[PDB]
């Protein structure tokens, strides 16, 4: 066959299309992913037939699927479908714009080439715009507080001339004629990144405003190089004349100032709707998170309207304009993320993000201090600065999963593709010990796992086996590189082991993670709590389905020295949760439905009442962290989605939180994002490095389209370099034609991954330079400051309700009041997005 | 589409399901692999439709395929099918238990969503349990030779308490009341890894037995810490009272001893069937190897019944119990493989395997000398020890393929996924020279191949081109890293080259591999044998279909200084062998069916009589090694399977070997496994490092389910770390849901592979530190002790029959007697297992 990589890829696309076709043929209303697969595959197939042009297929593609053949969200999610195929005249790109354009599609065309029977239209069974921006019906005023002038500009050229918003107007093409003197130090008063076009012979009046900041002109034609002043004005006019740049005095040109006034002729306005389309939303606007019920409101914006940093042809980030020409090379940003909506436990804000040496260097207003106000010296875009376009997108910290079983490498790829950039847990591969527990037991394995993962662009921490009554071996795994220890009932979670392990932690400044004695063999939950002796400990899967004293481990959520996490699969309580978990447990534990004691054990551990309580405890901030339990009772690619599904369920069933405004869900949003960002980092002792979008931390950042927030990110940035991203056909003319998949980027090749990341180890291990001993390229840092933590140190999740659990009925109360929530029948961030 | 890795994977699963559906639709009885694909895919598709619950699908899955729609082995092989899918309430796991439950399935449901026509039940055309354990109908007695007591135990707790077999009974939950004094130094007399459950208020009599070994109590509640003695008993009772642990004297409790007696009330028994289910089989039990006719009998077992090392919740390997608390940290095992059936040329035995520093540290009874008898100091499980669960599985050495053409890297992945951990051969990639011969000719290429393969977790040896009449260049490729040389007719296999090459080998202590002069251009087989001058040489594909003096190269199998191997594709003689090989040869040699001399050559080389003889010569031990000839006349993933298919064919056609018992096939099994384990290592000079499951060697080990023995292993361990393994959906809640594929593990990432492996080179190369010169991370060792070998040094394959071949008829005789076996029409290890 001599298949090239692109042929192999297009075959997969076709297979996805055929799956969508079979589904359509039985009357399934297709989701976004299926609709894209079908439309793209059909374009390829019509290209194969060789009877239709690109132009014809641009139209045909709009007729394949109607509103009735797709889910309600699809016409909102699907703006275009692109694919390339081999026509009789070679490879061509087809873009199908606005493909869901009719009530019912031409299903014979949708099924062309499939040999499937065409279904009657009545086979398709009879809301909410994902990622919607909500804004007040009003205008923003651009560029306020500046000198302004209106000038007549005439083209004497024979070819078109188009001038961008931030181009120094005196520097334009000599074949434009206008008052060059009045244009000195001015630029167009138009939306940032837009332009004014002059066809040959055109005369247009334009409004100009003064450049600001230091007011220094650089670049262009070098007509008026230098600070704006009287000397440099006269020099500029001398050059205008000497070089024959079109100039005509306009003595009576209107002059004034811009200000907040809706009637001022010098002003330029832009509606909030159009503003959000160009730059993303601004202060007071709201954004729907994915297809959830949650609305995030922009709390503040560092933008000065009119000076937005947008990159592109004719746009703002260009030499002498938004790109600074003359500052010290060493202070240029390495990368700027422009116009980001940042969602973080610290706030929901709008800002540019500056990255330098892999760190978040600055958050605020970026650009060029020579022409813009408000640009600090740590946010300068220079010649040596890359641009990532954040406008219209949400940026969050990379997620931190701190209950990882290192069962296989493939879960690492699944994790980062979902937006996780730090993994903490234990294991050696798919050995029984690791399949059960987060433990890398031997110093030999600690070395091998650090070496194995050295080129992967994630931060890693490995935990040893803490289940021992003597300290001797624990010291060894810690000095070998462990940054924590796991106490697990499968290795023994007895009071003697608990006490010994915590004593070790007090010495070594590492966190202890515990899965308690489900069997109550050595004691009940109160006896394990006693063994903690008031010392800091992280309780895994605190609700207990994932393990722990039956039936009342969840009591730990009210203990001050406990940092409690949930694992994902119980999040939130839904129709299938209990049946699913009961069988999962019996499979994991090799239990027999027909042996009473086995069934008694299973029912003692999988409990609707405690899982329902877990929904509420998460919502009120009494559970502080959400984690995976990857391939050992949980799902590595669903840490983020399960967190948001929980928040959505609780909003639906209980309304806004007490501390919530009712114009938005900001408090709930901040509380929940903390569960997979900052709190895992605090609990494990590396919060100075990662866990939030804050200056000085590693630039581990994830970019999301609001319509896909919480499910499928666009791009994962690790230490300031793109590590994984959505990319289409590698042979295509542009990066977006099908099939679009999450793929590894340059941060995954060679040893780049180590340069972008950190392996977290104990101080004892760093004291002997374990990175040198093991030949690691990845940076190593010691964990610290984890033995004086309490629940109060868990950001936005510091609640300590007194929890009781009825030993017979399993009824849970918090501060004497019943904790109940019904099961949900559906969740968002699911059916609208996934192919299977 | 924004496809995540799991979506791409599930699409492939669906495609496999659809293949199975098409096959079902035409009346094919599905094999195991197809049945799994179909059932898993159908569960996903019903989940997509959104009208069925997890519970409903657990039942529906049992109705899809009946016994008549699958092969006879399928109901035996298929215990469950698991898959995850996106329901309306998010991702859920469905397990379909015992899916083949009826005579005929509901084929409309089996084909749901496929749009395929449903076949009538009569379209399906009208034995042997693969991996079956056979055992005597009898009971084993646990824990014999111990003090025993029967105690009444009452729960005064309000929550359930469950106590494991090896928990120190005096240390249990204070809410159990019993005679704590009589419980001191005792544990439950129940099957290892099981438990006794106490619901609130329960009273149960339990039988306890004394701990053994050093008799030291550690862990638990630290009630009775220390060696069992009178002083520590009184201290324990003081603690019991001080701390309020439930205690009531039971003065008349029955006391005694356990012993071999079926009537003793203190005894606990377990039937052999249940024993084998929990721990794998024991002495005298038999295991069917895959779906072959071969039965392996356990020759001895190091277990002391009752003290089996089983890991899990409530089980044996826990702090102070089966996991030792107090021995020196440096002597903890790195990993223990528990309860393995070891099949090796040295014997078929049952044992734990201890791994330390990547080596097989010990084979025998593992655990904790403080509570168990029979644990030597090199088999101690400690806090820093990982567990691999071998119970129910077979462990073998990694296979060694010593006829590898390094034509592409992809054959390396195929090799290890099949259970091969060492490759020996030559090549540079898909150049003509390498496609024909196992030669890495240039020192430049030797360097590049060692560098190229440095991070792959296999051991490698590279052979140079030995076909030269002068020694000068041979010295150079050897000092560059060659660990052997290939004489090949394509480069000239003349007596002058043979003699020169062997002289070089005598100097350098490396093995020579030869493909002889098929054309008899310089001489007949006797002339090549003369050129050997009694020196050791390894004859590749000794039967000759793969190359060699026509028609009688097979004579070399009777020459004392020859070490003879077979290649795989002729193994064994079957219905299609001759037609397949005749055409393969004519394709490889660009021969023309219509040119008489071309056809004469082909028929002189591909001979039913010599291939039939090769079956017999392998069976009697006159051919010592089986190898691939990877992508050059043979199949890299079939070294192991073809060996077992040969053994199965010979048992079927000739019965047990002379040296075989008739209760089992142990001698034949040991003879055949030697062909791809120890004998390649002896022939090539690295048998001290690899090639058998023996103490001191590298821990290159393969885990097999008996039902899949010889086809598809579970896990491949390289240097003590998992290198490749079966793993399912990386996003799944557990490691087993579909699609389950052989995948690379942590031993393949970063530079871990080099840490786990060895590059074998000549002494000359090691003398100049070629690993340093080439910047290799992989360990390097020199081959040695290969110039004094004879056929007698080939383990269990040391036969030297006088072979004659009729030059006209090709009739083969051994010691004057006709060697004939008919062709087989089928082979095992094939149709039951493979998708294509
Ligand atoms: Na609901
Ligand atoms: Na209870
Ligand atoms: Na002949
Ligand atoms: Na046969
Ligand atoms: Ni757990
Ligand atoms: Ni876990
Ligand atoms: Ni050959
Ligand atoms: Ni060959």
């Amino acid at each position: 066959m001599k298949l090239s990589p692109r042929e192999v890829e297009k075959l997969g696309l076709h297979n996805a299309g055929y799956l969508a076709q079979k589904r359509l043929a039985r009357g399934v209303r297709l989701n976004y992913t299926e609709a894209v697969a079908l439309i793209a595959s059909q374009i390829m197939e019509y290209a194969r037939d060789g009877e239709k042009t690109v132009a014809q297929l641009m139209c045909l593609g709009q007729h394949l699927l109607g509103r009735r053949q797709v889910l309600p969200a699809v016409p909102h999610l699907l703006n275009a479908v692109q694919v390339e195929a081999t026509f009789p005249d070679g490879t061509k790109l087809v873009t199908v714009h606005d493909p869901i354009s009719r009530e019912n599609g031409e299903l014979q065309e949708a099924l062309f080439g499939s040999l499937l029977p065409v279904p009657s239209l009545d086979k398709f069974a009879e809301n909410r715009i994902p990622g919607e921006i909500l804004c007040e019906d009003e205008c923003l005023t651009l560029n306020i507080g500046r000198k302004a002038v209106i000038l007549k500009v005439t083209s004497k050229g024979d070819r078109p001339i188009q001038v961008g918003s931030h181009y120094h107007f005196i520097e334009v093409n000599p074949y434009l004629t206008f008052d060059r003197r009045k244009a000195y130090g001015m630029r167009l008063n138009i939306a940032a990144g837009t332009a004014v076009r002059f066809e040959p012979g055109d005369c247009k009046s334009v409004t100009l405003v003064s450049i600001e900041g230091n007011k220094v002109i650089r670049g262009g034609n070098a007509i008026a190089d230098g600070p704006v002043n009287e000397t440099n004005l006269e020099a500029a006019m001398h050059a205008v004349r000497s070089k024959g740049f079109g100039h005509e005095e306009e003595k009576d040109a209107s002059e004034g100032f811009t200000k907040e006034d809706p009637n001022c002729p010098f002003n330029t306005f832009i509606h909030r709707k159009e503003y959000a389309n160009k730059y993303g939303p601004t202060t007071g606007d709201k954004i729907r998170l994915g297809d959830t019920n949650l609305l995030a409101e922009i709390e503040k914006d560092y933008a000065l309207y009119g000076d937005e940093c947008v990159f592109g042809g004719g746009k703002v980030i260009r030499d002498g304009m938004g790109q600074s020409c003359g500052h010290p090379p060493a202070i240029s940003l390495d990368t700027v993320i422009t116009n980001a909506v940042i969602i973080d436990y610290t706030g929901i804000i709008k800002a540019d993000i500056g990255i330098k040496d892999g760190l978040i260097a600055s958050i605020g207003k970026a650009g060029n201090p020579d022409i813009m106000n408000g640009v600090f010296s740590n946010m300068i875009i220079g010649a040596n600065t890359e641009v990532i376009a954040g406008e219209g997108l949400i940026v969050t910290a990379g997620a931190i999963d701190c209950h990882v079983h290192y069962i296989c490498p493939q879960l690492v790829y699944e994790a980062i593709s979902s937006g996780i950039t730090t993994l903490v847990g234990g294991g050696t591969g798919p050995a029984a010990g690791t399949r059960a527990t987060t433990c890398t037991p031997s110093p030999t394995q600690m070395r091998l796992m650090l070496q194995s993962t050295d080129d992967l662009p994630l931060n890693f921490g490995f935990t040893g086996k803490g289940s021992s009554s003597k300290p001797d071996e624990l010291h060894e795994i810690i000095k070998a590189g462990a940054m924590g220890l796991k106490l697990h009932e499968d290795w023994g979670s007895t009071p003697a082991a608990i006490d010994n392990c915590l004593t070790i932690a007090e010495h070594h400044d590492i966190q202890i993670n515990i899965h308690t004695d489900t069997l109550n063999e050595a004691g009940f939950v109160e006896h394990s709590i006693a063994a903690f002796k008031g010392r800091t400990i992280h309780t895994y899967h605190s609700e207990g389905a994932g393990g722990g004293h039956a039936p009342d481990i969840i009591k730990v959520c009210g203990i001050k020295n406990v940092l409690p996490s949930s694992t994902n699969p119980t999040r939130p309580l839904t129709s299938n949760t209990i049946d699913e978990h009961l069988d999962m447990l019996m499979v994991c534990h090799h239990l027999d439905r027909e042996i009473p004691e086995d069934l008694a054990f299973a029912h003692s551990r999988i409990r609707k009442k405690t899982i329902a309580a877990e929904d509420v405890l998460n919502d009120i901030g009494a559970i502080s962290i959400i984690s995976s339990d990857s391939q050992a009772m949980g799902r590595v690619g669903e840490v983020i989605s399960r967190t948001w599904q929980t928040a959505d369920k609780m909003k639906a069933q209980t309304g806004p939180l007490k501390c919530d405004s009712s114009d938005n869900d900001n408090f709930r949003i901040r509380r929940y994002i903390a569960k997979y960002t900052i709190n895992p980092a605090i609990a494990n002792g590396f919060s100075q490095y990662v866990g939030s979008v804050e200056v000085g931390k590693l630039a581990d950042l994830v970019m999301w389209k609001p319509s896909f927030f919480g499910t499928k990110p666009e791009m994962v940035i690790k230490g300031g370099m793109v590590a994984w991203a959505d990319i289409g056909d590698p042979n295509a003319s542009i990066p977006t034609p099908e099939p679009v998949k999450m793929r590894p980027m340059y941060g995954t090749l060679g040893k780049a991954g180590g340069a972008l990341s950190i392996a977290f180890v104990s101080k004892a291990a760093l004291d002997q330079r374990v990175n040198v001993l093991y030949g690691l390229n990845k940076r190593v840092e010691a964990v610290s400051n984890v033995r004086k933590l309490t629940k109060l140190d868990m950001k936005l999740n510091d609640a300590l309700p007194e929890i009781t659990v009825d030993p017979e009925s399993y009824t849970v109360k918090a501060d004497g009041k019943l904790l109940c929530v019904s099961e949900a029948t559906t969740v968002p961030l699911s059916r609208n997005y996934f192919l299977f």
Side-chain angles (χ1 to χ4, degrees), chain A:
Chain A
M1 288 183 295
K2 298 171 54 69
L3 294 190
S4 64
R6 63 184 166 287
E7 288 165 289
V8 173
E9 291 243 27
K10 296 297 176 59
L11 180 61
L13 172 58
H14 176 91
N15 294 335
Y18 184 66
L19 169 70
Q21 288 174 310
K22 288 189 294 186
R23 285 175 175 172
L24 187 72
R26 78 170 182 266
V28 174
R29 294 180 66 181
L30 303 183
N31 67 21
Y32 166 86
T33 313
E34 292 160 339
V36 172
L38 185 152
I39 295 166
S41 294
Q42 291 310 90
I43 300 303
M44 296 196 300
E45 208 56 29
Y46 279 106
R48 178 59 184 89
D49 241 34
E51 299 297 343
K52 286 176 191 302
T53 66
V54 166
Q56 282 178 308
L57 291 182
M58 291 172 67
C59 294
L60 180 150
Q62 296 179 327
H63 309 154
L64 304 177
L65 298 172
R67 293 185 288 275
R68 293 187 66 258
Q69 286 79 52
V70 298
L71 290 178
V74 178
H76 300 298
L77 296 169
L78 192 53
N79 301 308
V81 172
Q82 300 179 320
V83 75
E84 305 203 334
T86 305
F87 286 78
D89 64 328
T91 312
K92 303 287 171 290
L93 169 68
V94 177
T95 300
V96 180
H97 299 269
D98 307 306
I100 314 303
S101 63
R102 310 177 163 181
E103 185 78 355
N104 286 294
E106 285 285 2
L107 304 191
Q108 179 171 305
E109 292 177 349
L111 295 170
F112 167 79
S114 75
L115 279 317
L116 296 170
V118 183
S120 60
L121 298 173
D122 65 358
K123 294 313 190 286
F124 299 91
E126 84 230 25
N127 225 338
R128 146 168 321 164
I129 301 179
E132 190 185 15
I133 303 310
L134 306 182
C135 64
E136 295 299 323
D137 180 14
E138 73 189 19
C139 310
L140 307 173
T141 307
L142 304 184
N143 301 319
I144 61 171
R146 299 180 189 227
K147 280 202 333 98
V149 64
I150 297 169
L151 286 184
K152 292 183 290 187
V153 180
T154 294
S155 167
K156 301 195 171 177
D158 62 352
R159 289 153 288 173
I161 296 166
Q162 188 162 306
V163 182
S165 64
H166 284 69
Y167 193 89
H168 295 284
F169 208 80
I170 201 175
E171 302 284 349
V172 301
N173 194 311
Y175 284 92
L176 294 184
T177 296
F178 53 97
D179 190 329
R180 297 258 177 182
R181 178 177 293 274
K182 295 184 179 295
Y184 177 76
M186 313 292 281
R187 64 169 184 79
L188 287 159
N189 191 10
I190 60 178
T194 68
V196 174
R197 186 173 182 85
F198 298 90
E199 300 284 351
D202 275 357
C203 186
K204 296 190 174 187
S205 296
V206 301
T207 303
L208 308 183
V209 285
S210 54
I211 63 176
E212 295 296 338
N214 303 320
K215 299 185 185 169
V216 178
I217 299 170
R218 300 292 184 200
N221 274 292
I223 283 283
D225 174 78
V228 170
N229 62 42
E230 291 188 356
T231 299
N232 290 339
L233 168 58
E234 299 303 327
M237 297 306 299
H238 187 277
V240 163
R241 193 228 267 207
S242 61
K243 299 142 120 286
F245 280 62
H247 171 64
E248 186 182 321
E249 174 180 22
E250 187 181 354
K251 63 173 214 218
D252 295 326
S254 291
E255 295 176 336
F257 299 89
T258 55
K259 56 182 123 56
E260 189 46 54
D261 174 7
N263 299 123
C264 184
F266 298 105
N267 276 339
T268 293
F269 307 100
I270 184 172
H271 194 279
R272 282 185 176 266
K273 178 182 174 171
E274 186 182 3
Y275 187 95
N277 180 79
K278 287 167 151 45
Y279 315 111
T282 187
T283 307
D285 298 339
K286 301 160 198 199
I287 309 166
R288 179 175 309 281
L289 299 186
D291 66 344
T292 76
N293 56 20
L294 304 165
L295 294 181
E297 178 174 333
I298 305 301
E299 299 176 334
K300 63 175 164 173
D301 186 352
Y302 287 85
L304 298 168
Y305 299 140
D307 266 344
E308 293 78 11
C309 299
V310 280
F311 166 77
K315 304 201 179 177
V316 180
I317 304 174
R318 298 190 288 145
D319 175 57
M321 306 174 229
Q323 185 180 283
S324 169
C325 202
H327 63 280
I331 71 172
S332 291
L333 290 171
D334 289 354
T335 303
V336 59
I337 303 172
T338 58
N339 310 295
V341 172
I342 296 168
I343 294 183
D344 190 75
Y345 90 93
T346 59
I348 299 174
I349 66 171
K350 182 75 178 298
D352 303 310
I353 303 168
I355 299 167
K356 191 172 174 61
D357 299 322
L359 306 178
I360 301 171
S362 48
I363 295 167
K365 198 268 173 293
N368 180 7
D370 282 339
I371 78 164
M372 300 174 169
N373 289 326
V375 186
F376 294 106
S377 68
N378 60 359
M379 307 218 61
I380 298 181
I381 302 174
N384 293 357
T385 304
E386 174 66 299
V387 173
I388 290 173
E391 46 269 24
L393 307 178
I394 290 164
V395 176
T396 67
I400 300 180
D401 183 4
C402 65
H403 191 150
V404 177
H405 292 252
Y406 296 111
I407 289 165
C408 67
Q410 293 77 20
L411 65 88
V412 176
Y413 313 138
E414 208 77 38
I416 188 163
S417 71
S418 80
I420 294 164
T421 48
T422 297
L423 303 177
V424 171
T428 64
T434 295
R435 288 177 54 150
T437 77
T438 48
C439 301
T440 301
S442 176
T444 297
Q445 293 138 13
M446 183 62 64
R447 177 175 71 242
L448 285 163
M449 292 298 287
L450 283 158
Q451 292 175 336
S452 172
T453 60
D454 198 49
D455 294 330
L456 304 178
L458 292 82
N459 315 304
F460 285 80
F462 300 94
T463 57
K465 192 199 299 171
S467 286
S468 172
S469 288
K470 270 201 154 61
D472 306 51
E473 293 189 76
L474 277 51
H475 283 300
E476 298 297 331
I477 194 59
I478 294 169
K479 75 189 315 180
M483 45 64 68
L485 298 170
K486 174 70 172 288
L487 284 159
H488 197 292
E489 73 177 322
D490 293 8
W491 300 114
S493 274
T494 56
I498 292 168
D499 175 52
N500 170 67
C501 188
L502 286 163
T503 295
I504 274 286
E506 291 295 300
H507 177 258
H508 279 288
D509 203 12
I510 59 167
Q511 196 54 266
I512 300 309
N513 309 310
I514 187 168
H515 169 138
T516 63
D517 186 352
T518 303
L519 307 178
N520 301 311
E521 175 183 53
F524 292 122
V525 65
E526 57 266 29
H527 302 115
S528 288
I529 294 169
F532 301 160
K533 299 182 183 186
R535 293 165 294 185
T536 306
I537 193 164
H538 176 186
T539 53
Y540 271 176
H541 43 64
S542 302
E543 174 281 326
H549 293 278
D552 54 356
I553 178 63
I554 202 165
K555 285 172 178 170
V556 296
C557 297
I559 302 298
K560 188 173 180 184
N561 50 295
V562 166
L563 313 180
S565 57
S566 285
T567 57
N568 66 21
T570 52
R571 312 282 77 250
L573 176 64
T574 70
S575 301
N576 285 306
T577 302
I578 296 296
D579 291 332
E580 181 203 29
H581 278 68
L582 200 71
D583 206 69
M584 188 190 299
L585 182 70
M586 299 192 44
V587 163
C588 280
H589 288 236
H590 293 70
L591 299 175
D592 188 342
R593 293 260 177 183
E594 321 292 39
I595 300 183
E597 293 88 353
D598 282 11
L599 200 55
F601 165 77
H603 284 307
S604 79
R605 183 163 148 180
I606 306 304
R607 309 163 295 251
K608 181 185 180 178
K609 289 182 178 181
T610 59
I611 297 170
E614 188 188 23
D615 285 348
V616 179
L617 293 175
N618 265 290
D619 208 47
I620 70 171
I623 291 172
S624 305
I625 290 168
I626 294 178
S627 59
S628 68
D629 222 341
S630 62
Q631 281 190 326
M633 293 234 37
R635 300 188 176 94
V636 81
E638 303 191 357
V639 174
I640 294 167
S641 59
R642 294 278 172 148
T643 295
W644 299 112
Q645 289 162 337
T646 301
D648 166 287
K649 184 204 173 166
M650 291 303 299
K651 176 179 177 180
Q653 303 193 13
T654 74
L657 291 171
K658 164 198 247 85
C659 273
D660 272 315
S661 299
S662 190
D663 308 301
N664 64 66
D665 301 298
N666 286 19
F667 189 75
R668 183 173 263 129
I669 291 166
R670 297 188 302 119
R671 161 167 291 161
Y672 277 78
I673 201 166
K675 297 171 185 289
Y676 65 77
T677 56
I678 195 62
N679 293 338
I682 295 167
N684 288 283
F686 50 71
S687 69
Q688 75 267 49
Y689 300 107
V690 291
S692 61
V693 187
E694 290 185 82
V695 170
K697 298 201 181 188
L698 203 45
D700 290 352
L701 297 167
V702 182
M703 316 286 298
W704 307 85
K705 286 178 169 184
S707 55
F708 290 82
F709 180 86
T711 45
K712 295 180 169 185
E714 297 302 293
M715 168 184 300
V716 176
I717 297 158
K718 185 76 193 64
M721 180 177 198
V722 181
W724 272 70
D726 280 346
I727 286 292
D729 177 7
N731 185 63
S733 58
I734 51 173
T736 48
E738 299 302 322
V740 171
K741 301 175 173 171
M742 242 299 169
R743 306 181 192 249
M745 296 290 124
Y746 287 93
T748 67
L749 298 183
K751 297 176 193 283
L756 303 172
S757 311
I758 302 171
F760 296 116
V761 300
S762 63
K763 189 181 191 299
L766 188 54
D767 283 347
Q768 60 161 0
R769 308 171 93 199
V770 291
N771 62 310
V772 177
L773 296 172
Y774 300 168
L776 307 183
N777 178 58
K778 193 172 290 180
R779 178 150 58 108
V780 175
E781 300 291 0
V783 300
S784 68
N785 291 326
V786 286
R787 310 310 312 155
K788 297 179 162 74
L789 301 174
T790 73
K791 183 62 157 298
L792 301 186
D793 297 306
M794 296 288 94
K795 303 298 192 176
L796 306 179
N797 291 268
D798 50 4
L800 287 164
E802 179 171 354
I803 302 294
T804 62
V805 181
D806 187 302
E808 219 162 29
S809 73
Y810 308 161
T811 293
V812 182
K813 296 183 180 180
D815 297 324
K817 299 190 217 63
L818 169 73
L819 291 189
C820 194
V821 66
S822 60
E823 57 199 54
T825 54
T826 65
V827 297
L829 308 178
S830 64
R831 303 280 288 197
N832 270 321
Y833 302 100
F834 290 94
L835 190 62
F836 289 94

